[PDB]
Amino acid sequence: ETFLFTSESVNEGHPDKLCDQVSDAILDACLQQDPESKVACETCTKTNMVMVFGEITTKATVNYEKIVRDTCRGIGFVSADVGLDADNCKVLVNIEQQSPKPEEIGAGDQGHMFGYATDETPELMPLTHVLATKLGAKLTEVRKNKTCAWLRPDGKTQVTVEYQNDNGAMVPIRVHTVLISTQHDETVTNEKIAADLKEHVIKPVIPAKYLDDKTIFHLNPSGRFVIGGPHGDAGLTGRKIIIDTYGGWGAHGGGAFSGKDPTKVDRSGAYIVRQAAKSVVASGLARRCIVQVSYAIGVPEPLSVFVDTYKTGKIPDKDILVLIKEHFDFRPGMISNNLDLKRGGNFRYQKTAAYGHFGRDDPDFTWETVKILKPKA
Amino acid sequence: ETFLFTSESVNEGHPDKLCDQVSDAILDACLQQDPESKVACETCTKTNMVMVFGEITTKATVNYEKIVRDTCRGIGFVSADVGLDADNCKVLVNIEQQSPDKKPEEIGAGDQGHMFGYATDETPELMPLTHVLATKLGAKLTEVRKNKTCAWLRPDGKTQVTVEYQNDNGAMVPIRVHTVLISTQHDETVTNEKIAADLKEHVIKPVIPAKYLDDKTIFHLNPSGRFVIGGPHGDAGLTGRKIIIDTYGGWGAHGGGAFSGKDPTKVDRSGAYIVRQAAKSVVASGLARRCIVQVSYAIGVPEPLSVFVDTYKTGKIPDKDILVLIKEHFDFRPGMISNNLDLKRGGNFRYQKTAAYGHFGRDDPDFTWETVKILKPK
Ligand SMILES: [Cl-]
Ligand SMILES: [Cl-]
Ligand SMILES: [Mg+2]
Ligand SMILES: [Mg+2]
Ligand SMILES: [Mg+2]
Ligand SMILES: [Mg+2]
Numbered sequence A: 001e002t003f004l005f006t007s008e009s010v011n012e013g014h015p016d017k018l019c020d021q022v023s024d025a026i027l028d029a030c031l032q033q034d035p036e037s038k039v040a041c042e043t044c045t046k047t048n049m050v051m052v053f054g055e056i057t058t059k060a061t062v063n064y065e066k067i068v069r070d071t072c073r074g075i076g077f078v079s080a081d082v083g084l085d086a087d088n089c090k091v092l093v094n095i096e097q098q099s100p101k102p103e104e105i106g107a108g109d110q111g112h113m114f115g116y117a118t119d120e121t122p123e124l125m126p127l128t129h130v131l132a133t134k135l136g137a138k139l140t141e142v143r144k145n146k147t148c149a150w151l152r153p154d155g156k157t158q159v160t161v162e163y164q165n166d167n168g169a170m171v172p173i174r175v176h177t178v179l180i181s182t183q184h185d186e187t188v189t190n191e192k193i194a195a196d197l198k199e200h201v202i203k204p205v206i207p208a209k210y211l212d213d214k215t216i217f218h219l220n221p222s223g224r225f226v227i228g229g230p231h232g233d234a235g236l237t238g239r240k241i242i243i244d245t246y247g248g249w250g251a252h253g254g255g256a257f258s259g260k261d262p263t264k265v266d267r268s269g270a271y272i273v274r275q276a277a278k279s280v281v282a283s284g285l286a287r288r289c290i291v292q293v294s295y296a297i298g299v300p301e302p303l304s305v306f307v308d309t310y311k312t313g314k315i316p317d318k319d320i321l322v323l324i325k326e327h328f329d330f331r332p333g334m335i336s337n338n339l340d341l342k343r344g345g346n347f348r349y350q351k352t353a354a355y356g357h358f359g360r361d362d363p364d365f366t367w368e369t370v371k372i373l374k375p376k377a
Numbered sequence B: 001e002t003f004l005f006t007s008e009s010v011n012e013g014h015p016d017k018l019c020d021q022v023s024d025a026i027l028d029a030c031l032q033q034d035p036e037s038k039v040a041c042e043t044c045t046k047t048n049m050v051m052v053f054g055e056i057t058t059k060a061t062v063n064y065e066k067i068v069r070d071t072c073r074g075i076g077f078v079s080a081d082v083g084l085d086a087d088n089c090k091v092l093v094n095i096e097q098q099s100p101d102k103k104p105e106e107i108g109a110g111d112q113g114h115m116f117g118y119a120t121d122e123t124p125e126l127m128p129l130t131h132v133l134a135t136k137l138g139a140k141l142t143e144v145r146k147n148k149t150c151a152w153l154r155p156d157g158k159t160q161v162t163v164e165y166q167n168d169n170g171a172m173v174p175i176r177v178h179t180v181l182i183s184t185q186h187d188e189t190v191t192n193e194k195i196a197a198d199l200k201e202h203v204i205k206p207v208i209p210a211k212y213l214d215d216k217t218i219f220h221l222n223p224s225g226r227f228v229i230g231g232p233h234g235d236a237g238l239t240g241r242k243i244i245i246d247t248y249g250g251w252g253a254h255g256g257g258a259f260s261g262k263d264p265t266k267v268d269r270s271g272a273y274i275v276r277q278a279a280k281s282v283v284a285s286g287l288a289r290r291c292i293v294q295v296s297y298a299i300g301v302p303e304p305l306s307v308f309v310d311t312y313k314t315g316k317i318p319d320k321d322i323l324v325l326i327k328e329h330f331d332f333r334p335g336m337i338s339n340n341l342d343l344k345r346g347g348n349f350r351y352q353k354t355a356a357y358g359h360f361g362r363d364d365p366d367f368t369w370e371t372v373k374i375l376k377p378k
Helices: A015-033 A064-075 A127-144 A190-205 A265-282 A317-327 A332-338 B015-033 B064-075 B129-146 B192-207 B267-284 B319-329 B334-340
Strands: A003-010 A038-046 A049-057 A090-098 A111-118 A151-166 A169-184 A216-219 A234-236 A288-295 A304-308 B003-010 B038-046 B049-057 B090-098 B113-120 B153-168 B171-186 B218-221 B236-238 B290-297 B306-310
Touching (some): A003 A127, A003 B113, A003 B290, A003 B306, A015 A049, A015 A234, A038 B038, A038 B236, A049 A064, A064 A090, A111 A265, A111 B003, A127 A169, A234 B236, A265 A288, A265 A304, A265 A317, A265 A332, A288 B003, A304 A317, A304 B003, B003 B129, B015 B038, B015 B049, B064 B090, B129 B171, B129 B192, B171 B192, B192 B218, B267 B290, B267 B306, B267 B334, B306 B319
Parallel strands (some): A049 A090, A169 A216, B049 B090
Antiparallel strands (some): A003 A151, A038 A049, A111 A288, A151 A169, B038 B049, B038 B236, B153 B171
16 A cells, blocks of 8 residues: 655765765866866865865866865854864865866776656655755755754754555655754754744745644754764765665665766766656656666776666657667766766855755756657657 | 666775774674673774774773774784784774663664665575675685685775676576676785786686676776775775665665664664565565565654565565565564574674675574575465
8 A cells, every 4th residue: 555765864064965065066176177177086074174085187276175174164164163163173185186089988987877767746856855855955045044043054854755656656645754853053942943943944845735733743853963063973975875866766876976077977877867767757758767877897888778667658668768869878978068067166066965966956957957758750 | 678787895905894894893892791782883994094983882891992903904904005004003992982871672763764675586695696796706805815815915995796687577587797897906016917817716716606607708807907005095984885785786775774883773784684584584485586675663663664565576475465474474673673683692703794795695694684484375
């Protein structure tokens, strides 16, 4: 009859997510000056420290430490009390930096990537992940627009949804449980925190049709949460790959995104298969769809592209695959040009590094822009 | 009508995996002295540094620094040239000790979450062939390094296997190994030709069934060149950064929760272990060719919100009837999992062994969640 699914997100001040954001801020800065930059930038944080390391090949002149402090400060790490003083903490820069036909650019590694789409939301994303990520984005918004000025940067959001399976399609019935644990200042009671999260975060984000008299709300269930981020903890880039993708739905190729230029198939491969899956569902060819691409090291053309519609396809899966191959170029150098991926600056990649790479209504997320696929007559 | 699937493993010297191992060594030490220990121990590594932190409630008296150095030395980090000098590197012990301060049936889930268990008839391990081969290639590299069959090996590296499959009415049927990639750390004098020949002879040949290999299988053996230093050197690692390698190599839905450094009162770990045991028991009992079992916990509640099974239409009986059998033969209450799978036993490398080369599909009797129950249909 029904089944449950749960997805979680962490806020922009969670230490792992901080690392993802710093890594993508460094990518953005390199690409702004040099679109041909090669970037493999990781960030590690712990009490009073942020370290950036990895390999960059660029013509860009970048002040890495300045990017680190400005990113941390902008998230809200302005003091030891919040959990990191962006301007006084230790910053270590251990990046190894050097100077330096799109059809012929090979995959840099062997790997595979999955893209998922589902008609259950207008974002064509799983409702569990849409709600978890939009709750976190709304927490950040209401902090910065001073609706809830008592908020601090760290926290987590989690949603459990009850579903029916309708001949392979996922049909959300109701939100079972909402959990929010948010960092806050000393000046608000637990009562005020819970009341404000219901009014200013939950009510705007969760469609009323999914809430009922039995939905469970867990609002700061583990108690007071005044300090956060790096303090007494650690984070690394690429430690939240389920949050970055589909919140647990579908098979996983394992590759992490942030700090990688788009010559890296972990990122460009994942983006193109989301675009393909999303396009299949948007075009009415299936209610739900997973698209896989597999790359061989040094080869431009994928080993294989595969589609599965979970028996929801309006035409056979092999016939959808013909349309996907007609309209999508999986060669990595061609993905980078077609999806305009070599553009940075104006937070292009830093935006992807919290609250999910997918499901975003933002034209910079070019992989969210559907192609309208019509079978040939 | 075939498709490809790829899984990867990293070797015990990979910095993330080193962290997992150190976290689980600390867990082992605490549980050996105090089976009721509460442990949430994470490890971070970078050049010349290992840091352990988190919260522990224990009656144990543990030399945390000695555990860290012994773990790293046994992995093979015996000098700075290897990528970490376990004997004199910086070790920071930042664990918060809480002083010690209930029926097992009444122990609630400590947070909200869900966990998936997977099994498939395609291997005797009842695991996906991609992941069996990737993890067994890594385990074999460690074996031949330490017994000096291939003494030139060093601890870091990765293994990757791509398999061609057919879908037989929802069952996964491996046809052949398409590509094998091995990237291993090694000493300063061994040659590339010796590395390739010994990897073929002593690692690939013993691990991969000959029936899957043919004249077209591709081998990439240290494709990116020389690899003498590794581990933490010029890198970083953290516990719980390799959750796909720890589980099923990409197959199935993922609940997101990491395992190492967590005592078994943590449903991320106990929950994942019991649903592996359940899925494995369904397939071993011939009730399905392939099965995923999901458990969902409510914060503070011992009984799961729900248990769910999907056989991908390969069940011999209806999925709802398999679910009745699962609930009759498995106790999903976390306190009862811990007792029934003897999870509070630590020491003797019990959890450290889980921390590299996969928590599932292992023949070691410490992996109590790999023991099959016969499920008789009614
Ligand atoms: Cl700098
Ligand atoms: Cl020291
Ligand atoms: Mg990859
Ligand atoms: Mg005509
Ligand atoms: Mg020495
Ligand atoms: Mg969890």
